[PDB]
């Protein structure tokens, strides 16, 4: 809730990288279910979360 | 300036009798004057420059021996190219053919702005690149 | 009158006085070292005055391009329409050989945070987003701690420094992509997308982060702004040659006795910089093979050129290279120069974003050819083929990374072609 309020209203998708990383810190890695959760919390299509996870190397998909 | 005697003929040009076309393929045929549509699989527009005149498709059946595609239409493969619509109608009228003319369909100009992909308060913003 | 030799900067003129973390980085240590002093007067002086001080200062970007900062920051000095205005501070230091921005963040955080406010006031910005790469976790935490102290002291936030100007400072962490150092790829990452650069136009000053006006300034370019305004542009412009003024942070790394980060005056001769601060090359200056003046993105130069070349934008351009990020990578005669540069091409193959054809397909192509030059499994006719391939990437790509992959190869072919052909001759003899 603090992360999503660092960005202008109407641009919640800007929080994908922080939240998707916060998911990994809690869980140690990012399963497909973790990505789908961040998609619905931020209300962005799940594919747009898959793109970020696969693009960046600090996200562990295994 | 031509030092040769000329005459005046007020009748429309009609060569149907001096072309050798059987009457079946003058009166019963429907020419189609059109600019070919762009092949949608490709982005090139170099086949949409000239007018074409095609005729009405007729029966194609199966050769009993080999299964090939037989035909009894001598005009099945006839395609003529014209620079302008008027040149196409002029050629069909003097040959006695009945024609339909379809007006050219040019794609209307559009407003392309690469910056609209990153709009602050509009839906044109793209979710990915 | 105008100087003729440069170097030997005095500690009385060093902007980053805590470059080694020998004093208190937290607040009340920065203030004791001249930070956050008389900031309200600078803000109340006016955006035009602040920009005028940076234009006269001759400061140029320390991110790798070296554009005149004063000219760039004036693009946001325009009437404000309905949209907000932001300042993005590029702390994504990822250029191989570059470590200067890491030290500013972890030891002088309050210089960066003050620079955000001064830079923002010049641009009329409402907030600053500091993009710092995700591997700098501890450094990012130090920056976050400093920002909290600034807010509690009234230095930033509502009525910053009592100036009546509102300014927020947000820290945003990257997720491990070197391409996100690019000014437009960095913006895309902040917007929560893949770090793929945009095309220009539109420029960030007209359409940027969230579609609003934006300026991307490197950590060093911003951290020096408050000092320039306090000490004026004349003091900063008095260093270095004309159009190359200022004090620059250098990162001497590789085959040297004392690899270190040090602040030194612009136009300092490269030989003096290596010997005086880094303790010379490993094995003696005569054991020097080549130097990469400004990180991997710049082409290398051989020993014959390092003896009389100054470290500034203009001096290194005449040498067929660039200043870049002022990171000096030294290679001695025991180095495998072909393998040293081949690994740099392999770096760019791994950091290419894949967006555009000449770098998605070309930099990978140059990688495979280079991996065969290391072993000599090629014929000499391929060297000219590799020269043309690089020229088809350079200037045909969306962003400058494609240029950064071509330049290392061009330098190798330019100054070390005999080593390439010798390697292939050896391989041919054995497998005859
Ligand atoms: C592939 C690539 C990586 C870059 N990485 C950085 C970086 O890590 N830090 C930085 O300040 N500029 C980096 N830049 C340069 C930026 O594009 C831009 O010049 C800089 O953010 C502007 O800051 P300046 O005003 O100090 O020059 C990079 C450019 C490219 C093409
Ligand atoms: S040059 Fe490479 S990194 Fe830059 S936009 Fe093109 S593909 Fe992406």
Strand content of chain B: 15-25%
Separation of the first and last Cα atoms of chain C = 66 Å
First-residue to last-residue Cα separation of chain B: 70 Å
Strand percentage of chain C, roughly? 5-15%
Number of helices of chain C: 17
How many strands, which pairing sense, and closed or not: the largest β-sheet of chain B?
Answer: 4 strands, mixed
Q: Which chain pair shows the most residues in contact?
A: A-C, 22 and 19 residues
User: What about the largest sheet of chain C?
Assistant: 5 strands, mixed
Shape of chain B: flat
Bound molecules: flavin mononucleotide, iron/sulfur cluster
The total count of strands of chain B amounts to 6
Radius of gyration of chain C: 22 Å
Name of the CATH superfamily of one domain in chain C? NADH-ubiquinone oxidoreductase 51kDa subunit
Shape, principal axes of CA atoms of chain C: globular
Multimeric organization: part of a larger assembly
User: How many DSSP-defined strands of chain C?
Assistant: 12
List the secondary-structure elements of chain C in sequence, H or E: HHHEHHEHEEHEHHEEEHEEHEHEHHHHH
Subcellular location (chain C): Mitochondrion inner membrane
Family (chain C): Belongs to the complex I 51 kDa subunit family.
Cofactor (chain C): FMN; [4Fe-4S] cluster
Membrane topology (chain C): Peripheral membrane protein
């Amino acid at each position: 809730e603090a992360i999503v309020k660092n960005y202008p209203e109407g641009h919640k998708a800007a929080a994908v990288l922080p939240v998707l990383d916060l998911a990994q810190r809690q869980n140690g890695w990012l399963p497909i279910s973790a990505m789908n959760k961040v998609a619905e919390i931020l209300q962005v299509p799940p594919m747009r979360v898959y793109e970020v996870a696969t693009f960046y190397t600090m996200y562990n998909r295994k | 300036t031509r030092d040769t005697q000329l005459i005046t003929v007020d009748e429309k040009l009609d060569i149907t009798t001096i072309t050798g076309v059987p009457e079946e393929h003058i009166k019963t045929r429907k020419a189609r004057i059109f600019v070919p549509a762009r092949n949608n699989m490709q982005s090139g527009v170099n086949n949409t420059k000239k007018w074409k005149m095609e005729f009405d498709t007729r029966e194609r059946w199966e050769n009993p021996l080999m299964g090939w595609a037989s035909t009894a239409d001598p005009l099945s493969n006839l395609v003529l190219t014209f620079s302008t619509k008027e040149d196409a109608v002029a050629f069909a009228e003097k040959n006695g053919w009945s024609y339909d003319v379809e007006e050219r369909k040019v794609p209307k100009p559009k407003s392309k702005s690469y910056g609209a992909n990153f709009s602050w308060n509009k839906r044109t913003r793209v979710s990915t690149k | 009158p105008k100087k003729t030799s440069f170097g030997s900067l005095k500690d009385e003129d060093r902007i980053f006085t805590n470059l080694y973390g020998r004093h208190d980085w937290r607040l009340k240590g920065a203030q004791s070292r001249g930070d956050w002093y008389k900031t309200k007067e600078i803000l109340l002086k006016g955006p035009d005055w602040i920009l005028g001080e940076v234009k006269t200062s001759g400061l140029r970007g320390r991110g790798g391009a070296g554009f005149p900062t004063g000219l760039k920051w004036s693009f946001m000095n325009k009437p404000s329409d309905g949209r907000p205005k932001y300042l993005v501070v590029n702390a994504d230091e990822g250029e191989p050989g570059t470590c200067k921005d890491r030290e500013i963040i972890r030891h002088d955080p309050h210089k960066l945070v003050e620079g955000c406010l001064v830079g923002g006031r010049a641009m009329g910005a409402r907030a600053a987003y500091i993009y710092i790469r995700g591997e700098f976790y501890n450094e990012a935490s130090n920056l976050q701690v400093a920002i909290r102290e600034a807010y509690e002291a009234g230095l930033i936030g509502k009525n910053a420094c009592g100036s009546g100007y509102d300014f927020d400072v947000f820290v945003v962490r990257g997720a491990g992509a070197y391409i996100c150092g690019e000014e437009t790829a960095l913006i895309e990452s902040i917007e929560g997308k893949q770090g793929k650069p945009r095309l220009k136009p539109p420029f960030p000053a007209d359409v940027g982060v969230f579609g609003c006006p934006t300026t991307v300034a490197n950590v060093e370019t911003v951290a020096v702004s408050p000092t320039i305004c306090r000490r004026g542009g004349a003091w900063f412009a008095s260093f270095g040659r004309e159009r190359n003024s200022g004090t620059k942070l250098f990162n001497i790394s590789g085959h040297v006795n004392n690899p270190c980060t040090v602040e030194e005056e612009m136009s300092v001769p490269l030989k003096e910089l290596i010997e005086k601060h880094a303790g010379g090359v490993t094995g003696g200056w005569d054991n020097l093979l080549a130097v990469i003046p400004g990180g991997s993105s710049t082409p290398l130069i051989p020993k014959s050129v390092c003896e009389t070349v100054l470290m500034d934008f203009d001096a290194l351009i005449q040498a067929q290279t660039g200043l870049g990020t002022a990171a000096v990578i030294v290679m001695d005669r025991s180095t495998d120069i072909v393998k040293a540069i081949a690994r740099l091409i392999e770096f760019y193959k791994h950091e290419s974003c894949g967006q555009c054809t000449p770098c998605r397909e070309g930099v990978d192509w140059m990688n495979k050819v280079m991996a065969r030059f290391v072993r000599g499994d090629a014929r000499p006719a391929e060297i000219d083929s590799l020269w043309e391939i690089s020229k088809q990437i350079e200037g045909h790509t969306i962003c400058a990374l494609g240029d950064g992959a071509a330049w290392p190869v061009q330098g190798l072919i330019r100054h070390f072609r005999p080593e390439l052909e010798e390697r292939m001759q050896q391989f041919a003899q054995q497998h005859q």
